[PDB]
Amino acid sequence: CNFTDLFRENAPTIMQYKRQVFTRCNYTLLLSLVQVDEFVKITPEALATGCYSSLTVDWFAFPYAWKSYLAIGSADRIVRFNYNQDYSNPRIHSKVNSSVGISYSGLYSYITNCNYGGFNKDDVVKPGGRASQPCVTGALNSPTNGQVWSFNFGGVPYRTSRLTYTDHLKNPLDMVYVITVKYEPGAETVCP
Amino acid sequence: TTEEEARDFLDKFNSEAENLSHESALASWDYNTNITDENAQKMNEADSKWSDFYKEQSKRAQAFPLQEIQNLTIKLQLQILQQNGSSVLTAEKSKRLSTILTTMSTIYSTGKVCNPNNPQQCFTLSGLEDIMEKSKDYHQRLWVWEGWRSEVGKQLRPLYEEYVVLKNEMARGNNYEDYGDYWRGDYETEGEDGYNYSRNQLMEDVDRIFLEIKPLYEQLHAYVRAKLMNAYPSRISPTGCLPAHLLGDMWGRFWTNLYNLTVPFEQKQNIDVTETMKKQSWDAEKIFKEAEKFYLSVGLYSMTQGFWNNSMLTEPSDGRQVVCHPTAWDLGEDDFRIKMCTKVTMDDFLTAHHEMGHIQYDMAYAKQPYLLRNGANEGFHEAVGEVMSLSVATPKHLKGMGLLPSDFSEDNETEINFLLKQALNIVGTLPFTYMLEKWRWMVFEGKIPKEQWMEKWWEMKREIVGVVEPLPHDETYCDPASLFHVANDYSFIRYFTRTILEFQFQEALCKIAKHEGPLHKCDISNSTEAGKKLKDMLELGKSKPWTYALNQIARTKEMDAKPLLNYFEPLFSWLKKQNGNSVGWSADWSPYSEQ
Ligand SMILES: *[C@@H]1O[C@H](CO)[C@@H](O[C@@H]2O[C@H](CO)[C@@H](O[C@@H]3O[C@H](CO[C@H]4O[C@H](CO)[C@@H](O)[C@H](O)[C@@H]4O)[C@@H](O)[C@H](O[C@H]4O[C@H](CO)[C@@H](O)[C@H](O)[C@@H]4O)[C@@H]3O)[C@H](O)[C@H]2NC(C)=O)[C@H](O)[C@H]1NC(C)=O
Ligand SMILES: *[C@@H]1O[C@H](CO)[C@@H](O[C@@H]2O[C@H](CO)[C@@H](O)[C@H](O)[C@H]2NC(C)=O)[C@H](O)[C@H]1NC(C)=O
Ligand SMILES: *[C@@H]1O[C@H](CO)[C@@H](O[C@@H]2O[C@H](CO)[C@@H](O)[C@H](O)[C@H]2NC(C)=O)[C@H](O)[C@H]1NC(C)=O
Ligand SMILES: *[C@@H]1O[C@H](CO)[C@@H](O[C@@H]2O[C@H](CO)[C@@H](O)[C@H](O)[C@H]2NC(C)=O)[C@H](O)[C@H]1NC(C)=O
Ligand SMILES: *[C@@H]1O[C@H](CO)[C@@H](O)[C@H](O)[C@H]1NC(C)=O
Ligand SMILES: *[C@@H]1O[C@H](CO)[C@@H](O)[C@H](O)[C@H]1NC(C)=O
Ligand SMILES: *[C@@H]1O[C@H](CO)[C@@H](O)[C@H](O)[C@H]1NC(C)=O
Ligand SMILES: *[C@@H]1O[C@H](CO)[C@@H](O)[C@H](O)[C@H]1NC(C)=O
């Protein structure tokens, strides 16, 4: 299993977060390479070993101090218009040394509001699903000051707003890696 | 060739007017749903563009005299444009009149009344209205009512006096006898055969309606008095008028807040569907979609795709501020919208249909020339919406929508509570509207000396509605101007008209629907014949006299109170049993005369 891309130079934003699915490959080292600050259904030691049908990991930049509302039970904008973590198939907070190519260039932002139609229906993210492109496009064209702007996509009117977290820049940075393991029997293709 | 040139003129006007109307209407809509200092000025500039256009076109319209033109369609559109309005006055009088209008409006809007027994406490009008519709304390109610009249009435009287003279001179400049006559002209129509209605005829039919509704009001008055007399013991005579400050309304227009004191059967519960909607997990979307089906079941028009995508139907969660108050919009270019902040409540289930009803009418006359894109009369616009509202409220509809138990039925006690609650909004409001409109008309006409304006106002109120003020006003007071629609340039007859038309239309649609029963049980849906007949009238707009438009539904030429009396027929009979010989009132009674 090749995890180079998890600690590679191009650290993603959440609005456009990245993920990689591993299958039919051989996967401790990932945790040695970065500095872990915290560990949060499956025990991380149970996750660390054993054979899985499939292993899927997503990652994005995110302040450690903001972890309070990244968890289940949160109804924050950082959950509904940002990243809705799935829990159906049984989260490491870490920082990355500047000695590791981690460029962290550009601006890091998130969506705060995204709705549409005459009923102002919230275009909320499905678990394991990214923000809708209409939401992504409106956010890209947003003033970044939090002001809500009007957009029209496919004839449907949208209201969208964007804010940043690009002020939280320390040499180690703050990143979150979420590993989900599918333990369905009969496959078992991802082993240590 | 005057008519031919006039036609080309009007087609050019109508085309540009639609484009300018769209820009203004859109800027206004966007502002109301997105309050920002950037949208503020934007809307006005758009409004000015239309205004500058309308006046240039007015001058052009006057080049096509109505005497030479024979085609009535052309004459009506030109007649609308061929009006000088304030541009008959000198610059000083025109500017002075505008200044007075702004000042009178401001005095009302920013008015407040302070507590005479405790200077620390003081309420703005919004707080004073809240007291009038809720408080049962005779004392609190009295100082807020009296205070409002003293605080604004004595500042507006002088302005209104000068305002009257200026409005009359303006009307003379526009070839009317006075400003009352100018307003009467809104009901005047030109046509052949029996489709001809005069300005003076309006007064005569209004008096006729008053007398026809009068006996229902007299029965309601005696009943209400008998109950308020116990609520406020030793304050009201067994026979006599009601105290103005105890009517549940700062201006004494509606008696609806008295329902809890005057309820026919205290032991009976009313119908409230709010609980059912919550149990059934309704949304705002469900309320509006059902509103569309109601009208499709009547047989009118569907909603457009633009309606569903662009209208602001609920309050946003975005952070932007919006204006909440139910309004039907027409932005032109077949762009129809409804603006409201819908909640899952039984009241909004009726309001959504009401606003939807306005759109149904607006769509119907969309095929008319720009200038004629209105209701036949302002009373029709509102009356049609109200008829549809009653049809939805009727329990048969609620059962059809699955909002009531199948084992639910109404008894003859429930029907009485329903009708009286309606009477407090419909019947008790009529002689008020009539009294106030007639008084102003005499003021503008010049039948009452300035020093007698106040005396005539209260003498009429005692004889027409049976309402009395507990502490006498020397004369400096101008109580009528304490009301929004008197301080501002608004007419009230439309409300008198709206109510009578509502019933004429409801009854006529019921017989088409073949409802063999009471009008309060009659619904209009699932009767496509009634739908089609209503379609034909709504489509007309101002291309025809309102007497024609009325005939198309009710088969009559004039206003008729009989349908109203019919609707409340079983209420009237019950009130007789309750009132006995107490029916009517003594206009010689007044709290001040007690000691
Ligand atoms: C509530 O009301 C406010 C006030 O009107 C609205 O604010 C406006 O929103 C529109 C978008 O709907 C903004 O238009 C965009 O402006 C961008 C430039 O921004 C800079 O320059 C302007 C001055 O012109 C500054 O005010 C601003 O602060 C920035 O410095 C353009 O780049 C955008 O271009 C896009 O559309 C054009 C269409 O022709 C395309 O060709 C482009 O490729 C691109 O897609 C656009 O023109 C407008 O500037 C905002 N006004 C102000 C004062 O900020 C809110 O949107 C409204 N909210 C809601 C929900 O209705
Ligand atoms: C608007 O006012 C103008 C005057 O400013 C009216 O035009 C005058 O009408 C009288 C009566 O027919 C003529 O004797 C004058 O010669 C006209 N003056 C001008 C400059 O044309 C005009 O008729 C009024 N329009 C309306 C609708 O009242
Ligand atoms: C008439 O009495 C009813 C109660 O039967 C009042 O309804 C209540 O109004 C308050 C708001 O002031 C609500 O919080 C309550 O929940 C309502 N109660 C019920 C059972 O719905 C009604 O307001 C009274 N009418 C007037 C004019 O005061
Ligand atoms: C409502 O309907 C009931 C039932 O018909 C009426 O009560 C009846 O009145 C007659 C005439 O006095 C009596 O002979 C019956 O015995 C009564 N029945 C019952 C169950 O009491 C009632 O009077 C009607 N109310 C109104 C206002 O019309
Ligand atoms: C990061 O750098 C510090 C300072 O030299 C070092 O002590 C730490 O072990 C390094 N951590 C990782 C994961 O390389
Ligand atoms: C909104 O309008 C578009 C046309 O621009 C139409 O395709 C779409 O179905 C409409 N959506 C709704 C909910 O009416
Ligand atoms: C009046 O003008 C309309 C067009 O606006 C036309 O259809 C109608 O036939 C004309 N009537 C007469 C009598 O010329
Ligand atoms: C109209 O007819 C339908 C059946 O097509 C019925 O479900 C609905 O309840 C009826 N409407 C009313 C008000 O009864």
Residue numbers in the entry:
A (entry chain B): 387 to 413, 416 to 428, 431 to 480, 483 to 584
B (entry chain A): 21 to 615
List sentences from the manuscript:
Here, using a pseudotype virus entry assay, we found that NeoCoV and its close relative, PDF-2180, can efficiently bind to and use specific bat angiotensin-converting enzyme 2 (ACE2) orthologues and, less favourably, human ACE2 as entry receptors through their receptor-binding domains (RBDs) on the spike (S) proteins. We determined the cryo-electron microscopy (cryo-EM) structures of the PDF-2180 spike trimer as well as of the NeoCoV and PDF-2180 RBDs bound to Pipistrellus pipistrellus ACE2, revealing a binding mode that is distinct from that observed for SARS-CoV-2 and NL63.
To determine the molecular basis of ACE2 recognition, we performed structural studies of Bat37ACE2 in a complex with the NeoCoV and PDF-2180 RBDs. 3D classification revealed that the NeoCoV RBD–Bat37ACE2 complex primarily adopts a dimeric state with two copies of ACE2 bound to two RBDs, whereas only a monomeric state was observed in the PDF-2180–Bat37ACE2 complex. Despite existing in different oligomeric states, the structures revealed that both NeoCoV and PDF-2180 recognize Bat37ACE2 in a very similar manner. Using biolayer interferometry (BLI), we found that the NeoCoV and PDF-2180 RBDs bound with the highest avidity to Pipistrellus pipistrellus (Bat37) ACE2 (apparent binding affinity (KD,app) = 1.98 nM for NeoCoV and KD,app = 1.29 nM for PDF-2180), whereas hACE2 binding was below the detection limit.
